[PDB]
Design a protein around this ligand. Structure first.
Ligand code: A3P
Ligand code: RTL
Ligand code: CA
Ligand code: HG
Ligand code: HG
Ligand code: HG
Length: 342
C-alpha cells in the first residue's frame, strides 16, 4: 500500500524551478514526507515500483545521479559475466533497465519536447519516436518483462524509501555517493546535455535549486542518508566515487567480494585499465554518443565528461563555497556520514 502523498510546488519553489527548468515540458511534484523531487509522470508507476516483485539474482546499481553509476554498472556487469568484454560491447542501455528513466517523459506533452531543440528539423524521427515510445513504458513493466532465466541488472536513482522496503533481503545493491559539489557541477552539465535547462540560466542558479532540494530526486542528503543507514546490510555496498579515482583496483576487489566473485590480480588490472577515463569516454557502448545522431544531445556536452574530483572549486565563488560548507556541515551534524575527500 503506497503510503506517500505528493504535493505541487508552492509559489516560491515553483518560481525558482520555472526560472531554470521552465522551458522543459515535464514538471515536478514533491513526494513523501521528505519531499523527493520527482517528475510528475512518476506518479503513474510509484505504487507499482513500491511493490515490484524482486528476485534473488537481481543486482541494482543505485545512486544520486552523476555520482559514478556508469562506471559501477560496467564493473558490475563484467564481474557478474566472467569478464566477457566482448559481450560487454552491447549498449549499456540494453544491459541494464533504467528503473526511473521513464519519468522524465510525459506522453501528454509529446509535441512540446522537440521544441527544446535548436533545430527540431534535424531529428532522426524514426529513432527519436522509438525513444519516446520506450520512455513511455513504466519502469516496473520493463523489469517484470525480463524472463526469470535472465539475470536482471537494474540502474536507478530512486532513494530506497520509494522502492520495496526490505528489498535488500532479496537483491544485492551497490550504491554510489560523491561529493555534492561535484555532483552539482556534473548535474549542471548533464542538464545542458539533454536540453533540460533554460539557456539563459547559469551554474549558480542550478546550485541554488540543487542545494535547496529543488532539483531532480533531491533532497540530496536524504537520498544518501537512506543508503548510508543500510550500508551494514550484507546485500548493500556503499562506495564513494572519489575512492574509484584513488584506488580503483581496491574498489574492484571490494565489488568482487560483495558479488561473491573471485578475480586474479591480472583480471583486476584488466578491469581497471578498461575503466581508464579516456578509453571509457570513447567507448560507444557506454558514452551514449549513439544518441547524438538522433539530435537530442547538445553540442559541447558529453555523457562521460571530465572524470575528476574537486573541480567544483572552478565553479563556486567565495560566497557559494561558504554556502556549500554550511549546507554540508548542517546535514552531517549528528551523523557518522563523512566523505573521503572532504
Ligand atoms: N571511467 C571513468 N573514470 C572516472 N570518472 C568517470 C568514468 N566514467 C564516467 N565518469 C564520470 O562519472 C560521472 C557520471 O556519473 P553517472 O554515471 O552516475 O551519471 C561524470 O562526472 P563528471 O561530470 O565530473 O565528469 C563522468 O565523467
Ligand atoms: C526520451 C526523452 C529525452 C531523452 C532522455 C535521455 C536520453 C535520457 C538518458 C539519461 C541519463 C542516461 C542520465 C541519468 O542516468 C529528452 C530529455 C531529450 C526529452 C524528451 C523524451
Ligand atoms: Ca513540436
Ligand atoms: Hg577503492
Ligand atoms: Hg588501471
Ligand atoms: Hg579541475
Amino acid at each position: 500500500p503506497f503510503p506517500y502523498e505528493f504535493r505541487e510546488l508552492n509559489p516560491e519553489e515553483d518560481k525558482l524551478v520555472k526560472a531554470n527548468l521552465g522551458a522543459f515540458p515535464t514538471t515536478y511534484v514533491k513526494l513523501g514526507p521528505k519531499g523527493y523531487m520527482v517528475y510528475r509522470p512518476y506518479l503513474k508507476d510509484a505504487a507499482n515500483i513500491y511493490n515490484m516483485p524482486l528476485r534473488p539474482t537481481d543486482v541494482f546499481v543505485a545512486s544520486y545521479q552523476r555520482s559514478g553509476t556508469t562506471m559501477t554498472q560496467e564493473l558490475v556487469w563484467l564481474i557478474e559475466n566472467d569478464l566477457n568484454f566482448e559481450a560487454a560491447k552491447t549498449y549499456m542501455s540494453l544491459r541494464y533497465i533504467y528503473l526511473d528513466g521513464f519519468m522524465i517523459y510525459d506522453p501528454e506533452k509529446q509535441e512540446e519536447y522537440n521544441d527544446i531543440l535548436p533545430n527540431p528539423e534535424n531529428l532522426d524521427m524514426e529513432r527519436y519516436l522509438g525513444l519516446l515510445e520506450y520512455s513511455s513504458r513504466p519502469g516496473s513493466s520493463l523489469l517484470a518483462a525480463v524472463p526469470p532465466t535472465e539475470k536482471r541488472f537494474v540502474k536507478t536513482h530512486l532513494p530506497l524509501s520509494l522502492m520495496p522496503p526490505n528489498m535488500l533481503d532479496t537483491v544485492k545493491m551497490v550504491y554510489l555517493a560523491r561529493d555534492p559539489r561535484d555532483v552539482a557541477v556534473s548535474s549542471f552539465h548533464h542538464a545542458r546535455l539533454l536540453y533540460l535547462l533554460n539557456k539563459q540560466s547559469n551554474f549558480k542558479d542550478f546550485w541554488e535549486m540543487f542545494h535547496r532540494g529543488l532539483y531532480t530526486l533531491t533532497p540530496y542528503f536524504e537520498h544518501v542518508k537512506e543508503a548510508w543507514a543500510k550500508r551494514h546490510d550484507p546485500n548493500m555496498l556503499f562506495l564513494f566515487y572519489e575512492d574509484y579515482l584513488k584506488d580503483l583496483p581496491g574498489c574492484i576487489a571490494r565489488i568482487a567480494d560483495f558479488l561473491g566473485k573471485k578475480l586474479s590480480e591480472e583480471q583486476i588490472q584488466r578491469l581497471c585499465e578498461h575503466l581508464n577515463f579516456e578509453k571509457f569516454k570513447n567507448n560507444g557502448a557506454v558514452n551514449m554518443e549513439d544518441y547524438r545522431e538522433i539530435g537530442i544531445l547538445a553540442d559541447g556536452e558529453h555523457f562521460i565528461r571530465k572524470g575528476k574530483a574537486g573541480c567544483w572549486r572552478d565553479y563556486f565563488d567565495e560566497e557559494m563555497t561558504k554556502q556549500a560548507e554550511k549546507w554540508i556541515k548542517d546535514n552531517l551534524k549528528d551523523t557518522d556520514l563523512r566523505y573521503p575527500n572532504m
